[PDB]
RNA sequence: GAUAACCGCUGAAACAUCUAAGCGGGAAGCCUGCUUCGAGAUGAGUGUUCCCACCGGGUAAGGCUCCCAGUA
RNA sequence: UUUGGCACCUCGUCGGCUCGUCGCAUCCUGGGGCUGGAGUCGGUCCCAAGGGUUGGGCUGUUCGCCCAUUAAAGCGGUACGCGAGCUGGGUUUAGAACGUCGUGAGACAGUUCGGUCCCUAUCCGCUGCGCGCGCAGGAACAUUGAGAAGGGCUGUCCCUA
RNA sequence: UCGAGAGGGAAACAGCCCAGAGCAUCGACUAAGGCCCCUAAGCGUACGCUAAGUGGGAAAGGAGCCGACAAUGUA
């Protein structure tokens, strides 16, 4: 499959927030 | 105007007609500005509008 | 309707032989001893029910909120609590002990417990779907669900359609299991059948909901 | 009972009555029971 | 000059009790929705809630004209296929009268995020007793004008 | 309503009380009550009156009077419905207040007597149902006759006393 | 428990009428009853017990993190 | 839901498998009226969509015929449901042959043998699992139930006889 | 009339009803269409009809009614 639309800035950043490291 | 007029027991339907028959035409812009702040003045205007109406309002003109 | 109940712990299965020499595969349930810790009522709590506390736990692993809830009924702290939704909860009393022999031979019970877990079960194993055949040239879909809806009308997958998800490890209630024998010395219950959950689980045994 | 939009008397004893918004014919000869619908 | 728009503190909500004893259901809802929406006082604005709390006692004795009691349904679909479940008002008004009056008033109000805030000011009860006795509610009769 | 116009007569020994629209008649056999539907009114001369001449008013006129007359007869003399049993082996026995029926079934039928309704057994093919309320007496008799409808080939089952069943020539 | 077709009691409008006021019976169907989820039911509920009235911060009851594991 | 007419949107047809979902014009099961219904079984009609509705031979086949059963082997809509789910047997490419047509290149709702079925799921949707916050003191435990999902099939023999 | 036509009404709905937008206006009167609540204005006054939610779809025909009857979910 292929992305139907360019992802809106809000939606892109909602997700990348989840890609965070944990404090040891 | 309709809310304030119904507080004094006259519907907006006929409060306007009475005002016409008293030649006291005063814009709605400011006729609604009296109801909020100066209730007495609006109360004094419904009195005029009620007495300027015909006795029986539904009889043939 | 009146419902007697008791917590147990499935221990395993074995077989017995009734007087007519008919193999009867039974499951050994170590039910009891369990004590009433609280009795609900229409006025205090709205409905009629009865807690019973079964288990063995040293007083050092019980936090104070529960350690004070047990001291109201004056019973040593147990580890598992449950309610039996009954209709005669006014006949119980705090601290009353419900022994294993609440049931007698022949009575039918409704055993309940957490079924065994199965992980993220696939389509076939969890809904008994069929496949697309191993042979005759099936391209990488030997175990696929198949289709999941129609074309542009409705253009949407219906809610409640059967997919693959986490199976098992959910509450299950087997019904009208027969209580073969009640060995009151050890406090066991020989029940003809297969109660839910793995060995060591916390089963509940209450009287037949049906047939009353 | 015969279900027909056209409900008519067949003999004299037939009585045309209106029950529950539906016109039916009641008669001693059970064959003449008729209901409109 | 600019026409007065009420600020948060110009509103002084009151409490009205509408005894619905043998009063038409539709005329109960319209009267309750007028008060709820705050559309009877000169401080009305279309973007702020100015209405008054409306308690409703005797919500089980709403008179219903004609064959409505046995013909009018109340449909409710769940999302799953074949999930439509309807209820005759004979059944609905028998054991859940409050849930039928509150549904009627809900329809007679905006379906936006403010109409749901207005609708929270309407308490419906089946008896003659409402717990809201500390709010000093004022009985509210239903009257017409000339 | 030609029926409604007719005045009502109250035999001696009957106490009639009219409290608004509800009439309570006390007789030697019991007491009955009824709320008359509006706008029909009743006055003691008993004469039933109607406000207007509307279609519905006329119907209610006659209906209301007929109910009232029934009570007066019902509390004075009462209603008895006779039922006869025809067939082979069909008998009726009275067990206290209940009736045992054997209409050719695998098990016997025990019909209970509703409050205010008594049963009389003259014979094991003839019985009557006595009572004060006409509707209830008729209801019980109909229910007892529903146990075994009368066959159209041999007229087997319970039937009303003197009720002429049409017989079909079995082919 | 209420109902469909249907079967009736009483009964007019006008003797008859299961109906126009009323009252019953009557389906694997409808609501319950059985199993499971279920207060994000933002209307966010209820119960028993515990902590105790400190100075942005330290804490009580009680948690979380970490380690050994499975009944996961 | 057929064979058609219009040409208004847009320059892999079918069949099978998998998975559903809905309508009732009901095949079975449930209730009932009438019967040219003695009984068993039927015919017709009325109510009824909860569940159920087998396996094979022939053909690509839908269809259809047949075999053995079954309480029954229902009719339809959903892009004649469903190929970003599978097959690829017929059908709409290129090879070759037969019949017929054509002077010939070739053609035929004639036939015959062979003949590449791509994609890492962004959005909605669906199946499961977490994180955050909320629910005006903070917690542990057990629960009411507004609502929702699941299940609803049926046969043979004995007694009554 | 649209095409090349904005604005109001018919729930949405180029072609239907009203009406032809130079620009501003927190004044007034009206057109089609409306005046129980959503939503501006009548729970208008008076007489009469309808009992079918007819109004809020339909025929031959039968005695406002029946005739009336498809598929995602009231529709």
TrEMBL record, chain C:
<dbReference type="InterPro" id="IPR009000">
    <property type="entry name" value="Transl_B-barrel_sf"/>
</dbReference>
<dbReference type="GO" id="GO:0022625">
    <property type="term" value="C:cytosolic large ribosomal subunit"/>
</dbReference>
<dbReference type="Pfam" id="PF00297">
    <property type="entry name" value="Ribosomal_L3"/>
</dbReference>
<dbReference type="GO" id="GO:0006412">
    <property type="term" value="P:translation"/>
</dbReference>
<keyword id="KW-0694">RNA-binding</keyword>
<protein>
    <recommendedName>
        <fullName>Large ribosomal subunit protein uL3</fullName>
    </recommendedName>
</protein>
<comment type="subunit">
    <text>Part of the 50S ribosomal subunit. Forms a cluster with proteins L14 and L19.</text>
</comment>
<dbReference type="InterPro" id="IPR000597">
    <property type="entry name" value="Ribosomal_uL3"/>
</dbReference>
<keyword id="KW-0699">rRNA-binding</keyword>
<keyword id="KW-0689">Ribosomal protein</keyword>
<comment type="function">
    <text>One of the primary rRNA binding proteins, it binds directly near the 3'-end of the 23S rRNA, where it nucleates assembly of the 50S subunit.</text>
</comment>
<dbReference type="GO" id="GO:0003735">
    <property type="term" value="F:structural constituent of ribosome"/>
</dbReference>
UniProtKB/TrEMBL annotation, chain D:
<dbReference type="GO" id="GO:0006412">
    <property type="term" value="P:translation"/>
</dbReference>
<dbReference type="GO" id="GO:0005737">
    <property type="term" value="C:cytoplasm"/>
</dbReference>
<keyword id="KW-0687">Ribonucleoprotein</keyword>
<dbReference type="Pfam" id="PF00444">
    <property type="entry name" value="Ribosomal_L36"/>
</dbReference>
<dbReference type="GO" id="GO:1990904">
    <property type="term" value="C:ribonucleoprotein complex"/>
</dbReference>
<dbReference type="GO" id="GO:0003735">
    <property type="term" value="F:structural constituent of ribosome"/>
</dbReference>
<dbReference type="GO" id="GO:0005840">
    <property type="term" value="C:ribosome"/>
</dbReference>
<dbReference type="InterPro" id="IPR035977">
    <property type="entry name" value="Ribosomal_bL36_sp"/>
</dbReference>
<comment type="similarity">
    <text>Belongs to the bacterial ribosomal protein bL36 family.</text>
</comment>
<dbReference type="InterPro" id="IPR000473">
    <property type="entry name" value="Ribosomal_bL36"/>
</dbReference>
<protein>
    <recommendedName>
        <fullName>Large ribosomal subunit protein bL36</fullName>
    </recommendedName>
</protein>
<keyword id="KW-0689">Ribosomal protein</keyword>
TrEMBL record, chain E:
<keyword id="KW-0689">Ribosomal protein</keyword>
<protein>
    <recommendedName>
        <fullName>Large ribosomal subunit protein uL13</fullName>
    </recommendedName>
</protein>
<dbReference type="GO" id="GO:0003729">
    <property type="term" value="F:mRNA binding"/>
</dbReference>
<dbReference type="InterPro" id="IPR036899">
    <property type="entry name" value="Ribosomal_uL13_sf"/>
</dbReference>
<dbReference type="InterPro" id="IPR023563">
    <property type="entry name" value="Ribosomal_uL13_CS"/>
</dbReference>
<dbReference type="GO" id="GO:0003735">
    <property type="term" value="F:structural constituent of ribosome"/>
</dbReference>
<keyword id="KW-0687">Ribonucleoprotein</keyword>
<dbReference type="GO" id="GO:0006412">
    <property type="term" value="P:translation"/>
</dbReference>
<dbReference type="InterPro" id="IPR005822">
    <property type="entry name" value="Ribosomal_uL13"/>
</dbReference>
<dbReference type="GO" id="GO:0022625">
    <property type="term" value="C:cytosolic large ribosomal subunit"/>
</dbReference>
<dbReference type="Pfam" id="PF00572">
    <property type="entry name" value="Ribosomal_L13"/>
</dbReference>
<comment type="subunit">
    <text>Part of the 50S ribosomal subunit.</text>
</comment>
From TrEMBL, chain F:
<dbReference type="InterPro" id="IPR019906">
    <property type="entry name" value="Ribosomal_uL6_bac-type"/>
</dbReference>
<dbReference type="InterPro" id="IPR000702">
    <property type="entry name" value="Ribosomal_uL6-like"/>
</dbReference>
<dbReference type="Pfam" id="PF00347">
    <property type="entry name" value="Ribosomal_L6"/>
</dbReference>
<keyword id="KW-0689">Ribosomal protein</keyword>
<dbReference type="GO" id="GO:0019843">
    <property type="term" value="F:rRNA binding"/>
</dbReference>
<dbReference type="InterPro" id="IPR020040">
    <property type="entry name" value="Ribosomal_uL6_a/b-dom"/>
</dbReference>
<dbReference type="InterPro" id="IPR036789">
    <property type="entry name" value="Ribosomal_uL6-like_a/b-dom_sf"/>
</dbReference>
<protein>
    <recommendedName>
        <fullName>Large ribosomal subunit protein uL6</fullName>
    </recommendedName>
</protein>
<comment type="subunit">
    <text>Part of the 50S ribosomal subunit.</text>
</comment>
<dbReference type="GO" id="GO:0022625">
    <property type="term" value="C:cytosolic large ribosomal subunit"/>
</dbReference>
<keyword id="KW-0687">Ribonucleoprotein</keyword>
<comment type="similarity">
    <text>Belongs to the universal ribosomal protein uL6 family.</text>
</comment>
């Amino acid at each position: 499959a292929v992305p139907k639309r360019k992802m809106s800035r809000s939606n892109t950043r909602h997700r990348r927030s989840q890609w965070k490291a944990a404090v040891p | 105007i309709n809310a304030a007029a119904r507080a004094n027991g006259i519907t907006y339907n006929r409060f306007i007609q009475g005002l016409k028959a008293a030649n006291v035409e005063v814009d709605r812009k400011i006729l609604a500005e009296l109801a909020v702040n100066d209730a007495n003045a609006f109360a004094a205007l419904v009195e005029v509008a009620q007495k300027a109406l015909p006795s029986d309002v539904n009889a043939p003109k | 309707k009146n419902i007697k109940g008791v917590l147990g712990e499935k221990l395993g299965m074995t077989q017995v032989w009734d007087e007519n020499n008919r193999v009867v595969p039974v499951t050994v349930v170590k039910a009891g001893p369990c004590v009433v810790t609280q009795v609900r009522s229409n006025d205090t709590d709205g409905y009629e029910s009865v807690q019973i506390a079964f288990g063995e736990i040293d007083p050092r692993k019980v936090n104070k909120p529960l350690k004070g809830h047990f001291a109201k009924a004056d019973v040593t702290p147990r580890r598992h609590l449950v309610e039996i939704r009954t209709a005669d909860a006014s006949e119980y009393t705090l601290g009353q002990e419900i022994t294993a022999a609440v049931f007698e031979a022949g009575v039918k019970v409704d055993v309940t417990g957490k079924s065994k877990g199965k992980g993220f079960a696939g389509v076939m194993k969890r809904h008994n779907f069929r496949g697309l055949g191993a042979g005759h040239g099936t391209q990488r879909k030997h175990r696929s669900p198949g289709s999941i809806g129609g074309c542009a009308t409705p253009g949407r997958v219906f809610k409640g359609l059967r997919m693959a998800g986490r199976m098992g490890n959910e509450r299950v209630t087997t019904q009208n299991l027969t209580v073969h024998a009640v060995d009151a010395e050890k406090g066991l219950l020989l029940i003809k059948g297969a109660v839910p959950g793995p060995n060591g689980g916390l089963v509940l045994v209450r009287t037949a909901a049906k047939g009353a | 009972m015969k279900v027909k939009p056209s409900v008519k008397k067949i003999c004299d004893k037939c009585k045309v009555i209106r029950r529950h918004g539906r016109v039916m014919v009641i008669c001693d000869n059970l064959r003449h029971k008729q209901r409109q619908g | 000059m600019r026409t007065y728009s009420p600020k948060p503190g110009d509103v002084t909500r009151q409490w009205h009790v509408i005894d619905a004893q043998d009063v038409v259901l539709g005329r109960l809802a319209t009267t309750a929705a007028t008060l709820l929406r705050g559309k009877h006082k000169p401080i009305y604005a279309p973007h702020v809630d100015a209405g008054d709390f409306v308690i409703i006692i005797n919500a089980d004795k709403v008179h219903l004209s004609g064959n409505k009691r046995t013909q009018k349904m109340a449909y409710r679909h769940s999302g799953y296929p074949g999930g439509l479940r309807s209820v005759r008002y004979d059944d609905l008004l028998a054991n859940n009268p409050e849930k039928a009056v509150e549904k009627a008033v809900k329809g007679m109000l905006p379906k936006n995020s403010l109409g749901r805030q207005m609708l929270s000011k309407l308490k419906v009860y089946a008896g003659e007793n409402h717990p809201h006795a500390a709010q000093q509610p004022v009985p509210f009769e239903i009257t017409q004008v000339a | 309503s030609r029926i409604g116009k007719l005045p009502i007569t109250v035999p001696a020994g009957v106490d009639v009380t009219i409290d608004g629209r509800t009439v309570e008649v006390k007789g030697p056999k019991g007491t009955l009550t009824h709320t008359v539907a509006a706008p029909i009114e009743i006055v003691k001369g008993l004469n039933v009156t109607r406000p207007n001449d509307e279609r519905q008013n006329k119907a209610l006129h006659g209906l209301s009077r007929t109910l009232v007359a029934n009570m007066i007869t019902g509390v004075t003399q009462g209603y008895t419905k006779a039922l006869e049993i025809s067939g082979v082996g069909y008998r009726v026995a009275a067990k206290g207040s209940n009736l045992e029926f054997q209409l050719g079934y695998s098990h016997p039928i025990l019909v209970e007597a509703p409050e205010g309704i008594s049963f009389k057994v003259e014979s094991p093919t003839k019985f009557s149902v006595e009572g004060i309320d006409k509707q209830k007496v008729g209801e019980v008799a109909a229910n007892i006759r529903k146990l075994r409808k009368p066959d159209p080939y041999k007229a087997k089952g319970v039937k009303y006393a003197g009720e002429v069943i049409r017989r079909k020539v079995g082919k």
